[PDB]
Each structure stands twice: as C-alpha cells, then as structure tokens.
C-alpha cells in the first residue's frame, strides 16, 4: 500500500532514503495488534481514529485529552492518514493530567495496568505500548517499564528531549525496553534528542504532522513523537508475524537503516526505524 503526501516520518520509515514523501506499507497495517499509549489520553472522536481508539484508564477526574500531545502520539501510532500503524487498535491511559504533568506514582500504576489490561483485551498479534513521558532517572520507573516489557508488551519510550545522555532519565534508562531518539527530515539528530548507549533506535522526531485535539491537527517536535514511530512500527511488525513483543526492539535495529543519520554522538547507535517494505 501507498499513501502519497504522506507525513514525512512516516514516508521515512519505509524509505532507504530521506525525502521522499510516500508511505509504503503492507496494508494488514497491524490488524489484530494493540498499542497503548501512556500519555495525557486519546480524543478517541476523532475522525482519523476511525473508532480504533477509545479511553481505557484514566487517573484523573476525565479521560478525556485535554492537552493533545497523547491524541498527537495516538495519531502516529494508528490514525488513517498520519499513523504507522493505520488498523492498530488504540488503548489510552492517561497519567498525565492535562499540562502533561504526572506523578512517578501514577506513571508506574498506569504501567502495570496495561500488563494486566491487555489481558482483558483482544490483540492476537501483540501488544505494544508507547510511553511518550519521562523524567529524572527512577529504578521505581525504570523497573515499571521492565515489568509491562516482561509481561509480553513491547515498551517503547522516549528517550527524553533534554540533549543529554538518557541514562539520567526514566523511564528512557530502563535497558529492557526500547528506548527511542529523535531525528529530523534531513537525517540530522533531531536537534533536542537525548542519546547515549541506552538508546536502541531513532524514530522520525522533528516536527511531526500528527492528530491534535478538537478534532484538528498540527506539527511538534520531541522524542515522545519518535516514540509513536516505533510503536506503530512494532504493531505493524508483529501483525506481520515477523516479530514478537520480546524481540521487537531489537528486530527493528537489526533492520533498521544503518549509518544514515549525521550528529549522532560517538557510541550512541547510528539506527532509523525501518519497515523494511518492500511494495
């Protein structure tokens, strides 16, 4: 499948190369997967969600998005125009109260809900979950994500937008999870990423054209809109059958495009996720 004018991170995610501007995609486009996005929630009427998302958890008065930066995550996960993973089905957990503030506590309970939830789900192809959130480095966090990783999610997470190495940041620190850094339209570093030896891949960061709320759209930066790259991305990989939850991390660096991206500090991977499709 194809979807010309397409968003350039998701036209580079299925291109050898930068700038080119279409989507390429096997169309099952993660049928049958589950990806939970761990955020400030999901305005599931939106019309790009096409009743693939719905609210399953929040912690605060609503689950409503009242911020949009989760709609936004949502949206690269699996919404029809600006998703990786265009028939994923999307789960939204709000931790984050709507300036996109949350405490570590709630974070942690809404991370071992979802290794709990996803058994009250169908998703016959896996389970994903993005986490486009961190702070300060927490082993209560990091051993959060280690957990919903353990329990057979895929756990992808931002490396953090500090410029810093992540290894002072949770849960981007967390080893057995997927880490994920930032990089822009001209396979530059995405200027803000954090990076580091924690980091597993870099997902398309800088201004990211994704769903906003009140049924709208706009463009951002930050490894939290990498994040949804990888996630969708797994979704779409384990639909294909050519990954599980343990192993996609890894299955999307051993395939990833090598080498490509500039301003990458030395020992931090040189890895773009890569769909690897061929139409």
Known sequence: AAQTNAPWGLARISSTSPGTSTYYYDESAGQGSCVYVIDTGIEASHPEFEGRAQMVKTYYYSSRDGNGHGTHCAGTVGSRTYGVAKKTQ???????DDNGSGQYSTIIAGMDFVASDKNNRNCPKGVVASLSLGGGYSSSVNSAAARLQSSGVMVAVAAGNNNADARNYSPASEPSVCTVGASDRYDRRSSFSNYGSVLDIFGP?????????????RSISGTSMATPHVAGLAAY???????????????????????????????????????????
């Open 90 to 96: 999307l789960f939204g957990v709000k931790v984050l």
């Open 205 to 217: 960061g800088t201004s990211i054209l994704s769903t906003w709320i009140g049924g709208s759209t």
């Open 237 to 279: 990989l384990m639909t294909l059958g050519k990954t599980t939850a343990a192993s996609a991390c890894r299955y999307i660096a051993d395939t990833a495009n090598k080498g490509d991206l500039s301003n990458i500090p030395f020992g931090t991977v040189n890895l773009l996720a890569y769909n690897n499709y061929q139409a």
